[PDB]
Amino acid sequence: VDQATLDKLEAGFKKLQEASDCKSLLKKHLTKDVFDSIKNKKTGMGATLLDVIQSGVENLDSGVGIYAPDAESYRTFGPLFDPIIDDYHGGFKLTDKHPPKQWGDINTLVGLDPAGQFIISTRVRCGRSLQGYPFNPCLTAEQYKEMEEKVSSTLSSMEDELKGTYYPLTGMSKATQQQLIDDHFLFKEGDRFLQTANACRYWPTGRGIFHNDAKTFLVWVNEEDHLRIISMQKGGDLKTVYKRLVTAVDNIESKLPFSHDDRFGFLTFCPTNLGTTMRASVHIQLPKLAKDRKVLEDIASKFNLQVRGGGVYDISNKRRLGLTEYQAVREMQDGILEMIKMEKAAA
């Protein structure tokens, strides 16, 4: 790698070492021996260790502090990624492998709480990188532009329920921005952690937003990953929300191959994603379980779910690695149904 890069890498490692109060996974796992073993390495696309650790060096208060500049970096800088992934994901050994992709048997799924006594809204989100492209820290302007062209064409040719409009950030009117804001569909340049990761260069070339006419499907193009893909609606029909997502992702893939890894699953810009990259969530009211939160948390543990809170909660999959997409949606289905049962049964 270039001397200029080595210069900053050495300075960065020293800064991390000297930051007594730093608690980032970057500082924890970037040992001298690991640093030396990879600092001179570079991916086929030309990413260096600096393109991985920049953000965490500049922002010492980062929880994790590393990003992936391309697909290959997960391997090339594996000596750093492996331990960090293991730590953040709560146990993913060197020999562990994420299960092959599987949407599963959608027939086994059901709509939740149609009466609407508990669930306010439902959404399932995932993310995808496109085969053959570097990730955010390493994309050029030409690459951003060319990618958006292919993504825009693909999304704009979607039909029926998924039919909708693509809005490039490039040249977006003030009226359009305000309409997307009212819908909360708009995004903009990221915070300091993204900026310093070089994730927001050449803004807003290649950045765009797609949603279907029904406003139950939304795609962000080149915000954090190449694609952030969301299905949502009011009420608790998780089956329908999930099925819509599956339909759209399959449709996109048929035209644009995804970056996938036999061990880490779907490769993303942030290593905290990976695996299914999928987060199914419901916004739900459980007033009675709210006064005995232990019962709730124990239920959530049983199904590997995360509870964010009174009585109103955002409940979601805790895991991205080590399970199938099907297991993800089923655990939410099973877990929410159990919570509803215990809510009804409570005093």
Side-chain angles (χ1 to χ4, degrees):
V1 314
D2 298 1
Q3 187 61 48
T5 303
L6 287 179
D7 286 352
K8 289 185 82 165
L9 283 178
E10 293 294 344
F13 179 87
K14 275 173 37 182
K15 186 189 178 176
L16 288 164
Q17 291 296 108
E18 292 156 10
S20 294
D21 289 342
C22 177
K23 287 175 166 55
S24 71
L25 299 186
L26 167 60
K27 172 181 169 69
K28 187 179 184 186
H29 295 285
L30 187 56
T31 70
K32 171 174 165 289
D33 283 0
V34 166
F35 175 68
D36 293 336
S37 80
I38 65 184
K39 59 179 179 184
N40 299 119
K41 292 175 176 290
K42 190 171 66 287
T43 63
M45 284 177 166
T48 76
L49 182 63
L50 187 60
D51 304 306
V52 170
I53 74 172
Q54 282 180 113
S55 182
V57 172
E58 306 247 63
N59 299 284
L60 292 165
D61 62 349
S62 291
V64 185
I66 70 158
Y67 292 98
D70 59 16
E72 186 172 9
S73 69
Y74 281 95
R75 188 150 311 179
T76 302
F77 307 105
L80 182 62
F81 276 96
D82 287 342
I84 292 181
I85 288 167
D86 169 61
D87 191 339
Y88 177 86
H89 290 269
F92 192 78
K93 303 183 305 179
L94 200 52
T95 56
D96 283 342
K97 296 193 299 308
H98 187 256
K101 193 208 71 179
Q102 182 55 244
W103 299 125
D105 179 3
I106 192 197
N107 293 149
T108 63
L109 301 179
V110 297
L112 312 169
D113 186 26
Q117 182 171 355
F118 311 95
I119 304 181
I120 298 168
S121 53
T122 298
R123 61 187 292 157
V124 187
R125 171 194 61 82
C126 70
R128 291 298 190 265
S129 299
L130 301 181
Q131 254 294 152
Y133 292 88
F135 298 168
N136 269 327
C138 286
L139 286 157
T140 65
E142 176 62 84
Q143 286 183 318
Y144 271 120
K145 184 184 302 77
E146 187 266 354
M147 192 202 296
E148 166 193 60
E149 289 171 334
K150 292 164 67 185
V151 171
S152 177
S153 172
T154 295
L155 301 178
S156 296
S157 69
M158 292 194 302
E159 293 176 337
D160 308 311
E161 191 183 6
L162 293 169
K163 178 58 167 300
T165 297
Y166 183 84
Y167 309 80
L169 262 60
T170 301
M172 178 181 292
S173 70
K174 304 304 177 179
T176 297
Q177 292 185 116
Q178 186 62 231
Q179 178 54 61
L180 291 173
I181 292 176
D182 289 337
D183 286 326
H184 315 284
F185 286 169
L186 188 69
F187 69 88
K188 63 190 193 304
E189 241 178 305
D191 62 3
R192 57 191 176 101
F193 299 95
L194 292 187
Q195 297 284 337
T196 63
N198 280 343
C200 302
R201 286 162 313 111
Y202 319 112
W203 203 267
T205 310
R207 280 65 170 208
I209 297 176
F210 176 93
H211 68 79
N212 67 347
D213 294 358
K215 295 183 170 174
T216 56
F217 180 69
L218 174 76
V219 182
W220 283 358
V221 183
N222 289 312
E223 186 245 359
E224 180 169 320
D225 283 297
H226 298 150
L227 299 174
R228 186 189 206 243
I229 310 175
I230 306 160
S231 176
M232 68 288 189
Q233 64 195 56
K234 282 188 185 175
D237 196 351
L238 180 58
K239 175 186 193 299
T240 297
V241 173
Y242 184 70
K243 182 178 192 178
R244 178 179 313 128
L245 182 61
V246 170
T247 301
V249 171
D250 284 354
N251 181 113
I252 294 170
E253 185 180 34
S254 72
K255 291 174 173 157
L256 312 173
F258 300 133
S259 172
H260 186 267
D261 188 86
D262 286 336
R263 176 170 168 249
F264 294 126
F266 292 102
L267 297 188
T268 53
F269 166 65
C270 185
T272 65
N273 214 172
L274 302 183
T276 62
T277 81
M278 177 183 297
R279 182 184 176 267
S281 69
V282 301
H283 193 58
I284 194 171
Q285 314 166 278
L286 309 163
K288 294 199 286 183
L289 288 182
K291 50 191 182 176
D292 190 4
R293 192 186 176 104
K294 298 305 173 298
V295 178
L296 179 59
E297 296 187 354
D298 278 352
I299 294 188
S301 294
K302 184 170 180 289
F303 298 93
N304 296 298
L305 304 180
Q306 165 180 119
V307 180
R308 291 293 175 266
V312 175
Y313 298 102
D314 293 306
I315 316 298
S316 58
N317 303 106
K318 183 181 52 190
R319 317 135 75 201
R320 308 292 181 261
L321 271 168
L323 75 173
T324 59
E325 290 82 353
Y326 179 76
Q327 288 166 261
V329 68
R330 266 295 301 274
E331 272 189 335
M332 270 296 294
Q333 174 178 292
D334 294 8
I336 299 304
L337 287 171
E338 183 60 4
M339 289 175 188
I340 288 170
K341 181 183 88 70
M342 291 296 180
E343 174 73 12
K344 294 181 186 176

